[PDB]
Amino acid sequence: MSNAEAFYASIRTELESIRAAGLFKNERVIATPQGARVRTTDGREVINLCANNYLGLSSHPQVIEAAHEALRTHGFGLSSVRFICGTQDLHKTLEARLSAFLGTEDTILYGSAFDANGGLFETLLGAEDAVISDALNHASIIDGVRLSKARRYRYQHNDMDDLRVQLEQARADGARYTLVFSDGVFSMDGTVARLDEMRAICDEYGALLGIDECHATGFMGQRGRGTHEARGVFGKIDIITGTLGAALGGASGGFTSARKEVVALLRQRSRPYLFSNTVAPAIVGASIAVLDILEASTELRDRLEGNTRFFRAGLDRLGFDVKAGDHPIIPIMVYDADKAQQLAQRLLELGVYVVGFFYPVVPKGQARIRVQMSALHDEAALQAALDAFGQAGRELGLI
């Protein structure tokens, strides 16, 4: 029995036990563009309440046509990293508009938020330095930190007192520079970081504050600029990392926006920036028009707030443990992974597209459905969906 084939057997044995534990993820094949309603290849058309299409720009006609013109004017692929021959005027234009949009002096584009985080800490920090992370920080942040030589501390989830204990200890352990880093809005539970307390606690110790803004840019704040606008620190952030693939288009790309020494050093030394393809001209192009939309009127994010409150207060009145609020991410815990596959399946049958969240996406035994609001939803969809949740929740024992 060969060594290579025992490996493949090991892998097959692993797959089985993932299925046994109710943890195997099955892909639905959508046959349509992204939007408020969606159709799998099988033919069924369902309400989509689990996309990152927070502002509904993934298939917004003026975003689609801006990408079209980018294809005409600036081509399909650049097949280069930025410093070689992958820099077009659009990249410089969009890095500018984001810096303006976000409150920072420059911005550096990446292929994703995942790679913006991956290349952040290693380039800026060393073994003598520290990174303090909220316990539930996103996997891409944990992997950025793992790739750096910095010392690591976690503070308990959104616990501002534990943030002080770690900052105390890191000072005590002798940290040169400290960077406090956290999801702006957290992926799996929707809660909002307390950037107002943190920027103050960071100011006592001289620490830096960085935030991952994927679940905030475009629709958090009065003018949609970020979680920092929503906590009144706009322009007081050392490091923003974020995506172009959530609210701002949903195609690809990410970014780090920081002072200008940072951005300049990231361009010089950040590994994904040096070593991975530049963003495609269509994406950069359509993102520049995305910023034209959101800077011209706050309506879409306003309709998002409305859709979110209506549906959060609705799931509340049905007995779900969902607080009233304006978090477009609405977590619905079912703990059992199998009971998550069922609830998502049953809600499919009832006309609602959600997907189970289980390990390793969330901790074993803390499985959930993550509802996700859009500006796209009209009230007969939000209503027909509330119906779907009340029934399937009743059948499965959730209310």
Give residues in contact with ligand F9X (CB under 6 A).
52, 81, 84, 112-114, 138, 140, 183, 187, 212, 214-215, 243, 245, 254, 274-277, 361
Candidate list 100, 160, 165, 274; residue touching its own copies; CB under 8 A:
274
Candidate list 161, 173, 261, 349; residue touching its own copies; CB under 8 A:
261
Determine if 348 is a binding residue for its own copies (CB under 8 A): no
58/243 with CB nearer ligand F9X: 243
Q: Which stretch binds its own copies (CB under 8 A): 149-157, 269-277, 308-316, 391-399?
A: 269-277
The answer to whether 210 and 238 have CB atoms below 8 angstroms apart is yes
Q: How far is the CB of 283 from ligand F9X (least distance, A)?
A: 11
Determine if 139 is a binding residue for its own copies (CB under 8 A): yes
Determine if 58 is a binding residue for its own copies (CB under 8 A): yes
Say which entry of ligand F9X, its own copies, none residue 62 contacts (CB below 5 to 8 A, set by partner kind).
none
Nearest to 273 by CA among 284, 285, 283, 264: 264
Angular region, 172: left φ>0, alpha ψ -120 to 50, beta rest: alpha
223: its two tokens: 């003018």
Q: Which stretch binds its own copies (CB under 8 A): 86-94, 157-165, 293-301, 319-327?
A: 86-94
C-alpha 376/C-alpha 355 separation (Å) is: 19
Residues 6 or more apart in contact with residue 4 via CB below 8 angstroms: none
**Strand 45-48 vs strand 352-353: parallel, antiparallel, or unpaired?**
parallel
How many residues bind to its own copies according to rule CB under 8 A? 114
Q: Which stretch binds its own copies (CB under 8 A): 57-65, 151-159, 225-233, 376-384?
A: 57-65
C-alpha 380/C-alpha 113 separation (Å) is: 34
175/251 with CB nearer ligand F9X: 251
Determine if 59 is a binding residue for its own copies (CB under 8 A): yes
128: its two tokens: 């003598």
The answer to whether 134 and 182 have CB atoms below 8 angstroms apart is yes
280: its two tokens: 């495609």
The answer to whether 180 and 163 have CB atoms below 8 angstroms apart is yes
Say which entry of its own copies, ligand F9X, none residue 183 contacts (CB below 5 to 8 A, set by partner kind).
ligand F9X
166/399 with CB nearer its own copies: 166
Candidate list 262, 348, 352, 392; residue touching its own copies; CB under 8 A:
262
Determine if 137 is a binding residue for its own copies (CB under 8 A): no
Name the strand (E) or helix (H) holding 352: strand 352-353
40: its two tokens: 């799998």
At 102, is the secondary structure helix, strand, or coil?
helix
Name the strand (E) or helix (H) holding 175: none
Say which entry of its own copies, ligand F9X, none residue 34 contacts (CB below 5 to 8 A, set by partner kind).
its own copies
Task: Show the beta-strand stretches assigned E in 120-172.
Answer: 130-134, 151-155
**Strand 106-110 vs strand 254-258: parallel, antiparallel, or unpaired?**
antiparallel
Q: Which stretch binds its own copies (CB under 8 A): 75-83, 223-231, 303-311, 380-388?
A: 75-83
Q: Which string of x and - marks every residue 91-130 that binds its own copies (by CB under 8 A)?
A: -x------------------xxxxx--x-----x------
Candidate list 193, 220, 237, 246; residue touching its own copies; CB under 8 A:
246
Following DSSP, what letter does each residue of 42-60 receive, concatenated?
A: TS-EEEE-S-S-TTS-TT-
- Residues 201 to 240 in contact with its own copies, rule: CB under 8 A: 202, 205-208, 238
Residues 6 or more apart in contact with residue 317 via CB below 8 angstroms: none
Candidate list 22, 24, 197, 346; residue touching its own copies; CB under 8 A:
24
Candidate list 99, 217, 227, 243; residue touching its own copies; CB under 8 A:
243
